[PDB]
């Protein structure tokens, strides 16, 4: 009965509003959560929309749709690939460079479309669907989903029905992630969705201006996690048809690009009002044809996009650094870090691809480890301005000294990261070699070994740099 | 490069 779903939904939505649960109990308060949600998933009844075909089945639907509001429908097909799931392929060859994918505005959902729709009058009374685009994107979803004569109904029947983000786990599958950076984030995630799911449950069984919506009396926890996963994992952001600000949207046709590593090449043209993908290499025909999604890590997309990508030279860790402010020193460091645009403590990252630290991190480090004489000749001089400003560059060391005692500094602090996951990077590459794993479960152990050999591999890089540099001490 | 780039399944923030 939707009075027992009610009362099930307010229980829910007050365990999901309390304070961060702790320190080592954020894996117990998921565990809470997860049992709630479990429950009130098992008495509803999955998707309230589903369709009578299968996906492939309304693909003509989606070109026959795309080609009548001026989009490209010509080179390519559809095709369901184990690895990525479906994707396009090409039937001609296409050369790099080559404009052959573009779809213009009038097809896109977009936040102001959402505010045009049938949610409208809830939106403009709604606090969180006015600050949250992309969940006000999510209701624009289910409520053309759940419109029999939508718009975009050839864009929804062609969507997944399911994916592979963390809110589609298992207990013992995220469980392998504990101890990492990576799983923190997939708190969040499922907290969030929960309490999102438990509030506007509530909104829209008692809201006035909800009453004569479709999600009325069909509206189930499967069908609020499909609408974030759907907009999490292929959400845009475009500019306005004027080109001031800055909105969130979804592109029809085009977001069937799977990813591969290289360069963006899918802009907006504010010209033609559309958006315009040109080929990232040289397809063959019969070739699959992939995007460069953006610079992320492994950790985003395992969480936002549902999959972990092998060859990520984009992956990174974070790492928490900061002066100390009973550091002797810290003053002038504050001020020379202002000096240099770097905050006194901050969040940076060690990278897959050397070098292991950015500009920015190499600076700080420099800083951080310099004496008194050297702060000087940063701080006061004709030299003081022009000593900064190389402050992040491989080539023009502080000194020998400054530059041995902040890669001691690096491989020690790595070295301790390390040891502070569950499992060691010898272990994971065993459970992946003989155990047989879902491809969730591959993602949870490949994020967590990654987050690993990162750390190794500053550690290394962290120590040849020491040596060169305290070999260059001795002469 | 482009004048807007249109990275797929940018990162938001979800907190609400
Ligand atoms: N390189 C890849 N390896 C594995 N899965 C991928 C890859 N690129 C994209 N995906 C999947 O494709 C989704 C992104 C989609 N917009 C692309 C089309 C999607 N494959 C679909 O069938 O609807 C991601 O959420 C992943 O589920």
């Known amino acids: ?72 429908v010509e080179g390519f097909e559809m095709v369901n690939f184990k690895e990525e799931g479906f994707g396009l392929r090409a039937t001609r060859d296409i050369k790099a460079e080559e404009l052959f994918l573009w779809v213009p505005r009038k097809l896109l959902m977009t936040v102001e479309s959402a505010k045009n729709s049938v949610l409208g009058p809830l939106y403009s009374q709604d606090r969180i669907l006015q600050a949250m685009g992309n969940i006000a994107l999510a209701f624009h979803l289910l409520c053309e989903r759940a419109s029999p004569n939508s718009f975009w109904q050839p864009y929804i029947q062609t969507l997944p029905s399911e994916y592979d983000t963390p809110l589609y786990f298992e207990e013992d599958e995220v469980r392998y992630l504990q101890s990492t950076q990576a799983i923190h984030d997939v708190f969040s995630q ?15 069984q008692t809201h006035p201006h909800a009453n004569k919506l479709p999600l009325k009396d069909s509206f189930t926890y499967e069908d609020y996690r499909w609408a974030v996963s759907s907009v999490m994992t292929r959400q845009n952001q475009i500019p306005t048809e004027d080109g001031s600000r800055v909105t969130l949207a979804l592109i029809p046709l085009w977001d069937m690009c799977n990813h591969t590593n290289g360069l963006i090449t899918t802009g907006y043209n504010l010209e033609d009002d559309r958006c315009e993908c040109v080929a990232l290499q040289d397809f063959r025909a019969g070739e699959q044809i992939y995007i460069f999604y953006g610079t992320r890590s492994n950790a985003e997309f395992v969480i936002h996009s549902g999959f972990f990508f092998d060859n990520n030279s984009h992956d990174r860790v974070k790492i928490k650094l900061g002066v100390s402010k009973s550091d002797r020193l810290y003053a002038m460091k504050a001020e020379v870090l202002a000096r240099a645009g770097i905050p006194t403590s901050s969040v940076f990252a060690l990278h897959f691809t050397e ?8 600076a700080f480090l420099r800083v951080f480890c310099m004496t008194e004489e050297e702060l000087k000749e940063h701080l006061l001089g004709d030299s ?84 060169y540099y305290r070999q260059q001490m001795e002469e | 490069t482009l004048k807007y780039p249109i990275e797929h399944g940018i990162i938001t923030n979800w907190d609400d």
């Open chain 1, 1 to 72: 009965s939707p009075k027992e779903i009610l009362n099930l939904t307010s229980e829910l939505l007050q365990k999901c509003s309390s304070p961060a649960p702790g320190p080592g109990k954020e894996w117990e308060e998921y565990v809470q959560i997860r049992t709630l949600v479990e429950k009130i998933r098992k008495k509803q009844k999955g998707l309230s929309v589903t369709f009578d075909g299968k996906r492939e089945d309304y693909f003509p639907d989606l070109m026959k749709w795309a080609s009548e509001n001026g989009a490209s």
């Open chain 1, 190 to 204: 499922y907290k969030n969705t929960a309490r999102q799911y438990a509030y506007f449950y509530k909104v829209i």
């Open chain 1, 355 to 362: 070098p292991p630290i950015s500009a920015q991190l190499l």
């Open chain 1, 384 to 467: 003081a301005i022009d000593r900064i400003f190389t402050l992040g560059n491989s080539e023009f060391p502080v000194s020998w000294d400054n530059e041995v005692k902040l890669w001691t500094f690096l491989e020690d602090r790595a070295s301790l990261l390390l040891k502070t996951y569950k499992t060691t990077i010898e272990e994971d590459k065993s459970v992946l070699k003989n155990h047989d794993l879902s491809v969730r479960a591959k993602m949870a152990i490949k994020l967590r070994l990654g987050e690993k050999e990162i750390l190794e591999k500053a550690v290394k890089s962290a120590a040849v740099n020491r040596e």
